[PDB]
Write a protein that binds this ligand. Sequence first.
Ligand SMILES: CCCCCCCCCCCCO[C@@H]1O[C@H](CO)[C@@H](O[C@H]2O[C@H](CO)[C@@H](O)[C@H](O)[C@H]2O)[C@H](O)[C@H]1O
Ligand SMILES: CCCCCCCCCCCCO[C@@H]1O[C@H](CO)[C@@H](O[C@H]2O[C@H](CO)[C@@H](O)[C@H](O)[C@H]2O)[C@H](O)[C@H]1O
Ligand SMILES: CCCCCCCCCCCCO[C@@H]1O[C@H](CO)[C@@H](O[C@H]2O[C@H](CO)[C@@H](O)[C@H](O)[C@H]2O)[C@H](O)[C@H]1O
Ligand SMILES: CCCCCCCCCCCCO[C@@H]1O[C@H](CO)[C@@H](O[C@H]2O[C@H](CO)[C@@H](O)[C@H](O)[C@H]2O)[C@H](O)[C@H]1O
Ligand SMILES: CCCCCCCCCCCCO[C@@H]1O[C@H](CO)[C@@H](O[C@H]2O[C@H](CO)[C@@H](O)[C@H](O)[C@H]2O)[C@H](O)[C@H]1O
Lengths: 155, 67, 79, 459, 172, 220, 86, 12, 102, 127, 171, 120
Amino acid sequence: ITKDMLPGPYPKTPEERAAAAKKYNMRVEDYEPYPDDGTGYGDYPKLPDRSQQERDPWYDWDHPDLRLNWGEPMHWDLDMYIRNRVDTSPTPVNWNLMCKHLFGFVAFMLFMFWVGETYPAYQPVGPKQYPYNNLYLERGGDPNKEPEPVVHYEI
Amino acid sequence: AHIEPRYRQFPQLTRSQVIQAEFFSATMWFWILWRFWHDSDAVLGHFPYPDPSQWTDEELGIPPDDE
Amino acid sequence: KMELPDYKQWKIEGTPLETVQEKLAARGLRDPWGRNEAWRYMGGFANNVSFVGALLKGFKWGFAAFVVAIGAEYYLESQ
Amino acid sequence: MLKYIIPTIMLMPLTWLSKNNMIWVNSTAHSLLISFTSLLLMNQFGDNSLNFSLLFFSDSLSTPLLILTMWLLPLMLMASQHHLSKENLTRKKLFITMLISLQLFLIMTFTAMELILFYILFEATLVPTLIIITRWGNQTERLNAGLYFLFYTLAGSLPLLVALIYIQNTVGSLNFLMLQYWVQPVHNSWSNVFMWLACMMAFMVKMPLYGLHLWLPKAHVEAPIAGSMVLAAVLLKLGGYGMLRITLILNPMTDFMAYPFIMLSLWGMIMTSSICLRQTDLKSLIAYSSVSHMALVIVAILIQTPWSYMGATALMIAHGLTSSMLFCLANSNYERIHSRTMILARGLQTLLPLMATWWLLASLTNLALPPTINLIGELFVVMSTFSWSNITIILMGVNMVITALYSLYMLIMTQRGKYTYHINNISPSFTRENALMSLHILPLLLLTLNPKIILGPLY
Amino acid sequence: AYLTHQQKVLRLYKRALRHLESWCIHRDKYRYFACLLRARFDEHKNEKDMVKATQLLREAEEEFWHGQHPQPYIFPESPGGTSYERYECYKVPEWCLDDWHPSEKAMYPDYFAKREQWKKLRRESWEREVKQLQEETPVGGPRTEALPPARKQGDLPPLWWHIVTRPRERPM
Amino acid sequence: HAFFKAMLFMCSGSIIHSLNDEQDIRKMGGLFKAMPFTTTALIVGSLALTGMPFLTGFYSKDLIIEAANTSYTNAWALLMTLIATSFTAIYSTRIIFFALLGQPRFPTLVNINENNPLLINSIKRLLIGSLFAGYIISNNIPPTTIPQMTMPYYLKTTALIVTILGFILALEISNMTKNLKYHYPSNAFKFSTLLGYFPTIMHRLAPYMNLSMSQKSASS
Amino acid sequence: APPLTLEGIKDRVLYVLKLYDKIDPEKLSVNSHFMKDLGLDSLDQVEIIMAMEDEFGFEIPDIDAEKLMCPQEIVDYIADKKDVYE
Amino acid sequence: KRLFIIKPSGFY
Amino acid sequence: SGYTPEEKLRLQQLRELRRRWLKDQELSPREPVLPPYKTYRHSIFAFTHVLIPVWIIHYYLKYHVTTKPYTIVEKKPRIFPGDTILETGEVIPPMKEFPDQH
Amino acid sequence: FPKYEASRLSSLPTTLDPAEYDISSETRKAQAERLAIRSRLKREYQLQYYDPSRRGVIEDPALVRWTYARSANIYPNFRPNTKTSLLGALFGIGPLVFWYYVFKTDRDRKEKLIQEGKLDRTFNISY
Amino acid sequence: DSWDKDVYPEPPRRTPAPSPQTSLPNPITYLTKAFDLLVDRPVTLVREFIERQHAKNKYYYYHREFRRVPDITECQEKDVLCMFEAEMQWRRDYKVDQEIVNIIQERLKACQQREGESHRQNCAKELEQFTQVVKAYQDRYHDLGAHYSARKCLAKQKQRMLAERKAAKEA
Amino acid sequence: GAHLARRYLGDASVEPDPLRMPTFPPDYGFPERKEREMVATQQEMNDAQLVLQQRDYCAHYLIRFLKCKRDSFPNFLACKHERHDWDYCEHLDYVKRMKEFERERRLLQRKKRREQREAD
Ligand SMILES: CCCCCCCCCCCCO[C@@H]1O[C@H](CO)[C@@H](O[C@H]2O[C@H](CO)[C@@H](O)[C@H](O)[C@H]2O)[C@H](O)[C@H]1O
Ligand SMILES: CCCCCCCCCCCCO[C@@H]1O[C@H](CO)[C@@H](O[C@H]2O[C@H](CO)[C@@H](O)[C@H](O)[C@H]2O)[C@H](O)[C@H]1O
Ligand SMILES: CCCCCCCCCCCCO[C@@H]1O[C@H](CO)[C@@H](O[C@H]2O[C@H](CO)[C@@H](O)[C@H](O)[C@H]2O)[C@H](O)[C@H]1O
Ligand SMILES: CCCCCCCCCCCCO[C@@H]1O[C@H](CO)[C@@H](O[C@H]2O[C@H](CO)[C@@H](O)[C@H](O)[C@H]2O)[C@H](O)[C@H]1O
Ligand SMILES: CCCCCCCCCCCCO[C@@H]1O[C@H](CO)[C@@H](O[C@H]2O[C@H](CO)[C@@H](O)[C@H](O)[C@H]2O)[C@H](O)[C@H]1O
């Protein structure tokens, strides 16, 4: 295409805002560029940061999988909002409340596990007893050295 | 086909599918009862559990408080 | 060309749908779709086993076979 | 090496004296015959390298790179002859001459026994490479890409020239065999700090090192397919090969001079892997993929361990075939839709089922699925950097995760989903395109059966 | 919102019934509660004050959000259903047949003979279809996506090819 | 586990196929008699999963529980494991109650048909496995430990009783769905349904932060 | 799944409407407008569409549903979606 | 009734 | 709320075209125009998928793998008290007497 | 009914938005022009999408602008200022310095242990 | 046989004689007889045919013998001709020592499998031998780096010899 | 068990600590304790390749079962008596450990009385 139809610098007048909105197929009212912080957006339209999953499933899109129409300005982060990636659709539970419940459950589980590790559950049974100086030779003890004997008695 | 669909009605069943299902459901219950009758310990316990409080100090060798 | 059953046969009487119409009737309301649901409570779909009945499917013949087998085992063990 | 240099030169008379309609058939056939004979370089010994003459030698490091270089020439000819069909006949022969002359400089670069002979050929590869990009690229920006490629390289090379000549003055020789026996340790001093930088910055720019890599995505996006193939497969490895040789004489200073560059590579590889997740241009995605892979090679060369040198050697070969395949795959799409926008043409597995198999195989090697040599190289490097410092497994682990995400994202976006409705010129894959893809993946997968011949001198 | 007030109420009614159905599961229980829910809509059916009617809609939507089923039932082939887009991988555009090898086309001599008539029919009609859209479109372009029918005999409705020849919903 | 879990998935496939790709249990029901062989396998699979005595699932799961409560263990992990064993009966009850019992809730054009021999034979082989494979294996593998067999009566039968209690409670909960009452959901109900919000929060937050950093900072 | 036919779809569309207590089964015809002829309102028409979705196991979006105003229109809509041509 | 199945060319 | 007269007419016209297109998708009787016991089948399967491979594998293992050291390493057989050793004829002594408590 | 606390990743349902209701002829005029713009682009696409003789790709200026915006156009509109520099300093230099001390400290600690013989390397002969 | 039992030792085999305590036929006994009949015999004859052809064309290959040359300790500084030979010899010995450690590792792993649950006590000699050889290999070659040479090896030894001398002086 | 409630919610000083038990001499209170006998030799257990944790004081019964299992093959339902012998021996081994716990608890109880009276 041509330079007049390509993105440009930040628009500085009501008229430059009009030519930009015309270029991006937008209404001069609906066109609002990114703030001119010097990050390089230029006059590219800032669009509602909404996932593509939020768009109407039943409308007849030119690109049904992307839910886009041929020629409409694409969100700066379109590739992050495709249906395979970030979804911003409303949740039946508020965002913050979801975080409180998931965090609270997890935090509580971890605390209770520590409490269960300090107060372990065990049976009223003495240590299991093994023969031959506690199987000294089997476990890999040195044959040459004479182990400290371990004696087990009846009861 | 060998089985036609029906509308708003209970479907058509072959004798084979009904009989085979009953045979394997029966085989499950025969198996459990047969095993339960022969291996009831595996579900209720294989050995008695002793009561520690019933053991005398002589068995445990607890010396009298005087000594 | 499939043959649908005659529609006049779907009635809510004698089904839980009738209890619904009685409860709604006590408020001044009606259920105009009750007959579109009747087929789920009539015919071979009426009377379904309970959960215990579901689990106990095949128990009758399984128990009988178990009784025979142990008796057969006993009579052999004795001799 | 004259049994390879001379027949490589004879490809130029062959191309120019061929009938007008046989330039591709003749050059392709005879460049394949040269590739066949290059296997004789695998007469390697356990102790001694293969030293032919005062000028050329071939050890286990240069042998696989030579074989990669000579295999790539026929593949580049196959990949170019479609988009050059309308070209003027003489300008077709000049294009082929640029590729043949690049192979000539390359096989002499990898076998030069003297480092100043290595420098000249190492630099000589710029001219044919630059001419390919700027003459036969398609976009306006190919001119800027040529300048960035030229001046990034020269900014580093010219200091290297001073350092090598200074080294010859003090040591008396630049013969690599002589350096092995006459090497003296490098003691700390600001004078040696800058000798170290001059010896390593030229190679760091070629790899490229993160931070100094900006020339690479520019060059790839503007180069013709054959240019992108040689750039990714071989010319990047001139940095790695040069570093693996020169580090001999930089010890023990490499102990602490490596730190700033290991940090750049370890962090840079995560940064360039993550950039791939948001690239809109398919060629640019593959370019940034190379930066992430070559970051591992830089780390491995700098930690200077037997396992890391084996891993770097395998990574360079494995990356060479995989990245070349990926550029060829993206090109076949481009020859149809004439755009590099990744999201433009989707759901292509429905329209080109067999080309979707190649896309799958290429992606699997790119994410290093075991036992591919991509995984062998990447695994050996990770083992050695773990001993260098245990915490590096964190950065290595994350890169492996992000590498899988962008590799399969590229596969899913282009090959899966629904096809784009208005794009209706997706013709069935040509035999040339399918044979080109298979000549990349089959040798790459065959090398898994016998990986010792690409593991380098420390095997 | 381009939806009138009537459309919003009717849409809310349907959506409320479906989420009610998900809660109730059993058909008899759903019938009982769907009628009470309908009774509530009938209660304000004649509200002639738009301000109050809109206010009733707001509260109704607020109530639906609180009471909506977190995991409502979805028809399998509906957006979000377990079979949505399950068959897109089998839908192949008809222009792919122009690339078939002649030996492939020879296997279906009758199908490709008919296909040629459709392609012939498409070329012949195109010029009149562009013309009809030129004469019926006001200066400044169209204002809606609605398309006209054919106005004569032998004319085809403009822009018909990709609706008529679209892939079958169960292609393979 | 391999035996009865593969069978359960195959039984659900039998139902899904007969109901024209329907997978929501709310839209099944009344299949206990309509699909007799799929029903038998589903009940056997469910009982095997919940450690019914002497079915294949009893020979592994039951030993694990009795070793768990007779070991030197975290007391919380033991308590969590037991409660989950009760939950196993509850969700097993859900599948049977909603898929098989009650009145049909599927569309009107009935096409139920489980009479393909390939379907019957494949399930039949796994059904025999789910009944005897556990018994066969336990009696053939060599012993490599010291199995714990002495224990209090209440530790011996913990697995069985918590399973039975879950069945009883699960049945009561299932029956309440039939009553003509409407209740607002509890926070607990939403938490369970939405999988503890972990997929909801984490599969939006992690992708967003990493992907946004890739474009904004790394690239631009 | 057994295929659908235009005659089969029509039969079931009428069948469902004959089980709706607000319609007169004798006065019903394929061409009866739900309001002009049968004297129903729009709340009733939403329920009729809801019942058609339940009958055939697929959803008609509200934008499309509000236009189906007689039984023949429903039969046509279903046939188009299911590729029924007879 | 057997319908024609539209596929991309498999010949090449 | 129904269709406008203009819309209904367009839907009518597309419908006749679509149903005609769908009708044309049917195959004619002659299409496609193609170009020019259990024991036995299970017997041939066993021969080519079991016997021939196990021949190759046994030849491979016996005369190539096992000729090299430590290529196949077996856990040594368990020896129980009272066992007799085939290689030597050595008899392993029985265990000492138990208390025989039952 | 606790109200809806919308977030970045959990948007606000339109049914709960006041903006959707309380419509004015001014808004309705806006929705009219938006739809008119959409239909103008749809018509221009459909005329090329349905053209019998068109074989190729329908170039979309919206897509070219998007890709051109997110690469070639950034630098001309860049300004070195407090925001860009502070962000550049934090995310470009900062991570390198952080990782330097992590690895340098870890390697220094290990090197000391090896000299004193306090790091076990009994079987470590692969590196 | 095929290898040397000294380099790769295998303790003598002890197989318990069958002691069937059941009337039932053993499935393994008959499958073994079938395997010998259906697999071993045909495979054995096919091999004997191949071994006949080889016996008609008997030829030999040899294991190269490398004369010993002066090591890097005897080389004058920067004398490449003597350094080259010592350097190549040191490289050859480095490869051989690598395979020595592989042999000792192979013994260790074969013992661990052979002894089963008793490996902990019955592979003490193999473990001890492995521990010693890995210590010797580590002392020779560890930490030399990718660019290792006979010179770097010698410098590492001298540094080790110096440390041992100083500790001995403290004694 | 109840013992846990006593140790955690009650006075732990009179409840054994399973980790450090026993905390009294073996013969304290027992005139002439005998030493547990072991039937299977180390070589027999070594040759039988028993798992080290199975090489306890009931190992001789385990060896008998393992030998019987091999010799009764393929009748995988034989050797039930040998298994039970081994199981019962392990039960007796477990009860011994239970007595050790009760002994330890009573000694702790005694040493608390024997301290309190000396305290006052
Ligand atoms: C069988 C399961 C066994 C394991 C059980 C584990 C139990 C885990 C319970 C974790 C509870 C954490 O969730 C916690 O719940 C309360 C109740 O809403 C929240 O409370 C929040 O919501 C409401 C507000 O409308 C108020 O209670 C409060 O103003 C607010 O903080 C906490 O913010 C949250 O942190
Ligand atoms: C290894 C143990 C093997 C145990 C095998 C035990 C015997 C197997 C018995 C299989 C029984 C098959 O026979 C089947 O039984 C059931 C129950 O009576 C019958 O079902 C009967 O009761 C139901 C309910 O009243 C009726 O709907 C049905 O019409 C009637 O026939 C089936 O119609 C019959 O086909
Ligand atoms: C990408 C860029 C990477 C940059 C990496 C920076 C590495 C910094 C290395 C600093 C150490 C340089 O090496 C150091 O130099 C001085 C040279 O004056 C030497 O020391 C010499 O000069 C100093 C003066 O400062 C005198 O005090 C000293 O008596 C003399 O010997 C040190 O013996 C040496 O240790
Ligand atoms: C571009 C990324 C920026 C990230 C920040 C990177 C900072 C990099 C700093 C380079 C290293 C400088 O610090 C360097 O440490 C090494 C130790 O290994 C020192 O090495 C020297 O000193 C040590 C003790 O200090 C002694 O063993 C010996 O004299 C020698 O090894 C160097 O004298 C010093 O110059
Ligand atoms: C290890 C395997 C353990 C398997 C355990 C198997 C289940 C154990 C039995 C659970 C309880 C049995 O079921 C018990 O009796 C009848 C069922 O007829 C139930 O009775 C119920 O049936 C009808 C069903 O229409 C309900 O509408 C009604 O509300 C109620 O009366 C009881 O509410 C229940 O307590």
